[PDB]
A paper describes a structure:
Integrin α6β4 is a major component of hemidesmosomes that mediate the stable anchorage of epithelial cells to the underlying basement membrane. The β4 subunit only pairs with the α6 subunit to form the α6β4 integrin, which is a laminin receptor required for maintaining the integrity of epithelia. The third and fourth fibronectin type III domains (FnIII-3,4) of integrin β4 mediate binding to the hemidesmosomal proteins BPAG1e and BPAG2, and participate in signalling. The crystal structures of the individual FnIII-3 and FnIII-4 domains were solved and the relative arrangement of the FnIII domains was elucidated by combining DEER with site-directed spin labelling.
The structure of FnIII-3 (1457–1548) was refined against data to 1.60 Å resolution. The asymmetric unit contains two copies of FnIII-3 that are almost identical. After superimposition, the root-mean-square difference (r.m.s.d.) for all main-chain atoms between the two molecules is 0.59 Å. In our crystal structure β-strand A extends to A1468, similarly to as observed in other FnIII domains. Y1494 and Y1526 in FnIII-3, which are phosphorylated during signalling, are adjacent in the structure. Near Y1526, one of the FnIII-3 molecules has a sulfate ion coordinated by E1501, H1503 and two of the waters in the cleft. This anion is of interest because sulfates frequently mimic the phosphate group of phosphorylated residues. In the other FnIII-3 molecule in the asymmetric unit the position of the sulfate is occupied by the carboxylate of D1519 from a neighbouring molecule in the crystal. Collectively, the pocket near Y1526 has a propensity to bind negatively charged groups, despite being surrounded by the acidic residues E1501, E1518 and D1519. The sulfate near Y1526 in the crystal structure suggests that FnIII-3 might tolerate phosphorylation at this position.
Residue numbers in the entry: 1454 to 1548
The structure:
Amino acid sequence: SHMVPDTPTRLVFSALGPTSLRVSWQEPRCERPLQGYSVEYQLLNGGELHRLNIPNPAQTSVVVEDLLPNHSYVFRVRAQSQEGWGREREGVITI
């Protein structure tokens, strides 16, 4: 039922200046060892797909840079096990 990781907990956003933030979550349940996370983010109204891969399940935060002021973004965080990638936790924010 949770061989691939469950969804992470709700995303917490912390502003770090005008073009950066910290995105944070908590480690999701999994019946298999967690291998890491992906953080995918994209302008709400369209743009390039950005991805940060975090190969350590103990790191549940990351600093995201070069964001556009006054623009809205969709962040999607997933965790990986040997069984595959789990469902995303989605959170949105305006910079």
